[PDB]
């Protein structure tokens, strides 16, 4: 599924991500925009042999099981394929674990390089939330 911007904002808010770990909704929408272009089906191989999955590009070395990643810990206890569903529940639940792991949203490369420190409120401008 390719979400619209406000569509994803609404879903993320319903699932409790606005201000989760102190990260405003705009931070999570900006992260999704630059990680996946709001596409639940997005996948991208990493050099270490892991792959990132879904709207928040969750990695198969630590978080989800894809059956082909050396060193995989599956800390979200989910198949990586679950993170590609049109239903974002699994991605949200796993993202909550990741952002709680110590370094906050810095886990998300694209957030750190493209969202952190910017006017992230713009990402929810116009939305009825």
Give Dmax (Cα) for the chain.
Answer: 43
74/124 Cα distance (integer angstroms): 32
Residue 20 Cα to chain centre, angstroms: 13
Helix (H, G, I), strand (E, B), or coil: what is residue 20? strand
Is the distance from CB of 91 to CB of 83 less than 8 angstroms?
A: yes
Resolution of the solved structure (Å): 1.4
B/e letters for 37-57, b = 16+ CB within 10 Å, e = fewer, are ebebebbeeeeeebbbbbbbb
State the method. Answer: X-ray
Active site residues: 35, 52
For 54-97, give the DSSP string.
TTTTEETTTT-B-S--TT---TT-SBGGGGGSSS-HHHHHHHHH
Question: Any known ligand binding at 101?
Answer: yes
46/30 Cα distance (integer angstroms): 21
Tokens for 98, please give them. 């990741």
Locate the domains of the chain by residue range.
1-129
Of all helices (H) and strands (E), which one includes residue 30? Answer: helix 25-36
- The reply to whether CATH 2.60.40.1120 applies to domain 1-129 is no
């Amino acid at each position: 599924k390719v979400f619209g911007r406000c569509e994803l904002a609404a879903a993320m808010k319903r699932h409790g991500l606005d201000n989760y770990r102190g990260y405003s909704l705009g931070n999570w929408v900006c992260a999704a925009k630059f990680e996946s272009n709001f596409n639940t089906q997005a996948t991208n191989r990493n050099t270490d042999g892991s792959t990132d999955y879904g709207i928040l590009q969750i990695n198969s070395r630590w978080w989800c099981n894809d059956g082909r990643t050396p060193g995989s810990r599956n800390l979200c206890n989910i198949p990586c394929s679950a993170l590609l569903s049109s239903d974002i529940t699994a991605s949200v639940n796993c993202a909550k674990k990741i952002v709680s792991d110590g370094n906050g949203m810095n886990a998300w490369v694209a957030w750190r390089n493209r969202c952190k420190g910017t006017d992230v409120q713009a990402w929810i401008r116009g939305c009825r939330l």
